[PDB]
Amino acid sequence: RPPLDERSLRDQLIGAGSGWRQLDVVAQTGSTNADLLARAASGADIDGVVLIAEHQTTARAQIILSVGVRVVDVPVQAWGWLSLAAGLAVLDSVAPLIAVPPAETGLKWPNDVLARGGKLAGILAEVAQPFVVLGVGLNVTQPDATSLLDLGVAAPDRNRIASRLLRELEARIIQWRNANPQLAADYRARSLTIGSRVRVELPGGQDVVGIARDIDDQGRLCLDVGGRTVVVSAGDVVHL
Numbered sequence: 435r436p437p438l439d440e441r442s443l444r445d446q447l448i449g450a451g452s453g454w455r456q457l458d459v460v461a462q463t464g465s466t467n468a469d470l471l472a473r474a475a476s477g478a479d480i481d482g483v484v485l486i487a488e489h490q491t492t493a494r495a496q497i498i499l500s501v502g503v504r505v506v507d508v509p510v511q512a513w514g515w516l517s518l519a520a521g522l523a524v525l526d527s528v529a530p531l532i533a534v535p536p537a538e539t540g541l542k543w544p545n546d547v548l549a550r551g552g553k554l555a556g557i558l559a560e561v562a563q564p565f566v567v568l569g570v571g572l573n574v575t576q577p578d579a580t581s582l583l584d585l586g587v588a589a590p591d592r593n594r595i596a597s598r599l600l601r602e603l604e605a606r607i608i609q610w611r612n613a614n615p616q617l618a619a620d621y622r623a624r625s626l627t628i629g630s631r632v633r634v635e636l637p638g639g640q641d642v643v644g645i646a647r648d649i650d651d652q653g654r655l656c657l658d659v660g661g662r663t664v665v666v667s668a669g670d671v672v673h674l
Contacts, residue, residue, distance in 0.1 A: 435495065435592065436494075436592070436593070437488060438486060438593055438596065440457070440458065440459040440486075442593065443457055443486075443593065443597060443600075444457050446597055447484075447597065447600055447601070453482055453604050453607065454483075454484055454600065455481070455482035456482065456483045456484065458484070459487070459488065460485070460486070460487050460488070461487075461488050461493075462487065462489045462493070463487050463490065463491070464491045465490065465569075466485050466486070466487050466490065466498055466500035466569050467500050467560055467567045469485060470485055470502055470567045471560065471562050474502065474562060474567075475562070479504075480565055480567070481503055481504040481565065482502065482503075484499060484500070484501050485499060485500045485501075486498065486500075486596065487499070490571075494592070495573070495574055495575040495576050495581075496571055496573050496575075496576060497570070497571070497592055497595060497599065498570065498571050499569070499570050499596065499599070499600075500567055500568065500569040500570070501568045501600075502566070502568075503565060503566050504564050504565055505561070505563070505564065505565060505566045506563055506564035506565075508611065511651065511652045512610070512613070512652065512653075513559075513561065513566060513653075514544075514652045514654065514667075515617065515618070515651075515652070516559055516566055516610055516653075517544055517558075517568065517653070517668070518541075518544060518621055518649070518653055519606040519609070519617055519621070520568050520603060520606065521555070521557050522541065522602075522620055522621050522624060523599065523602035523605070523606045524547050524557070524599060525539065525540070525541060525547045525554075525624060526602045527595070527599040528554070528555075528572070528582065528595070528599075531582070531587055531595075532549065532582070532585050532587065533585055534550050534585060534586070538550050538551075539554070540626035541621065541626060541627070542625075542626050542627055543625065543627040543649070543655055543671060544655075544668045544669075545668075548626060549585055551578075551580075552578055552580030553578075553579045553580065554572065554573060554579075554580050554581070554585075555570060555571060555573065556571050557569070557570060570599070572599070574592055574595065582595075618649065622648075625649075626673065627646045627655070627671065627673070628648065628649070629645070629646065629647075630673050631646075631673070632645070632655075632657070632671045632673055632674060633671065633674060634655070634657070634666050634669060634670070634671050635670060635672070636669070642657060642664055643659070644658050644659035644664060645657060645658045646671075647663075650665060654666060
């Protein structure tokens with residue numbers, strides 16, 4: 435499997451009117467997110483910045499990237515939709531090239547892209563104002579998880595995949611920034627979770643079981659529990 439071509443990616447995605455201002459690829463690092471936070475922490479403006487790592491402390495079998503966004507100009511109660519928008523971007527960028535029926539793949543709230551029941555990719559948002567750092571990990575050539583390879587992509591072009599992924603990610607971030615109602619609708623159309631019976635595990639061995647009915651303006655899960663609405667903030671759920 436070839437390495438990423440840093441130069442080609444830059445020619446493609448930067449700049450004008452692209453929202454990506456910078457992009458770097460590094461052979462190795464611990465976290466893409468930490469590296470980016472370190473940079474902001476130290477006074478860097480990381481909005482629009484992409485960091486890709488060939489390996490995170492096997493190498494080059496996943497696409498791992500992180501992006502930075504300035505969120506401060508957006509209402510704090512909509513930040514929660516940013517990590518959701520990111521998964522949609524991953525599913526969208528990867529669906530066209532996939533053997534399975536689109537219906538078998540979907541979004542699992544709040545962090546996961548699933549194909550045929552197995553985790554294709556994960557999303558990690560960490561906030562650090564004025565920024566949020568979105569981290570993506572997609573299994574290209576890798577518990578019970580899955581990869582584009584297992585999914586029929588015979589030879590995946592990480593360069594092409596990363597490139598498409600950044601393009602959708604840019605599209606969704608824009609929609610999120612614009613309070614676009616389509617982002618939420620697109621997210622619902624592809625949710626595995628909505629319409630599903632789910633259990634939410636809560637600290638202390640507590641759990642709630644209900645039917646996921648919607649996602650609220652803040653990105654939280656709405657459960658129908660016997661006709662009462664219970665809303666939960668981002669956390670982990672199990673389908674049933």
